Write a protein that binds this DNA or RNA. Structure first.
Ligand SMILES: [Mg+2]
Ligand SMILES: [Mg+2]
Length: 86
RNA sequence: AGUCGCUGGGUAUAGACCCGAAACCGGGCGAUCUAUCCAUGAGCAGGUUGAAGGUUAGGUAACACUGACUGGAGGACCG
């Protein structure tokens, strides 16, 4: 993922902060990066050592959602529907 | 003492006392039956079975894979 494509996302899903630590910043950065790789793995089929890196990012994303659900519900469904998951 | 007739018995060559093969060769006739092919036609009551596919619900990062609804394949099944 590029540098300005990171800066496009942090500007968008900022929690009126200027700050990159909140889960709505972190979940957004991972989800844009999984969608980019899906055509790398339709050309490269036998790329197994890079398949291993993608499953790290998927499992990291389901851990931050349950932390988000384990605190609030209003912040949760305002983020699930804004990305279209589950 | 031989020669040319005539009438008889033989012999040679021609179907050669009469009847009787299976086969072989040469010009034709035939695919209105039957054996394949070609062009143009039509014939097969009824009653079962239920493939692939598709839709949608779940499902998965995605493809997996599940269910339901449909669907109408076969040198398929009874008749
Ligand atoms: Mg004829
Ligand atoms: Mg004929």
């Amino acid at each position: 993922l590029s540098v300005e494509e990171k800066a496009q996302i942090v500007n968008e899903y900022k929690q009126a902060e200027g700050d990159t630590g909140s889960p709505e910043v972190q979940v957004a950065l991972l989800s844009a990066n999984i969608n980019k790789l899906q055509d790398h793995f339709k050309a490269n089929g036998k790329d197994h050592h890079s398949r291993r890196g993608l499953i790290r990012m998927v499992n990291q994303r389901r851990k931050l959602l349950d932390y988000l659900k384990g605190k609030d519900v209003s912040r949760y469904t305002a983020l699930i529907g804004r990305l279209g998951l589950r």
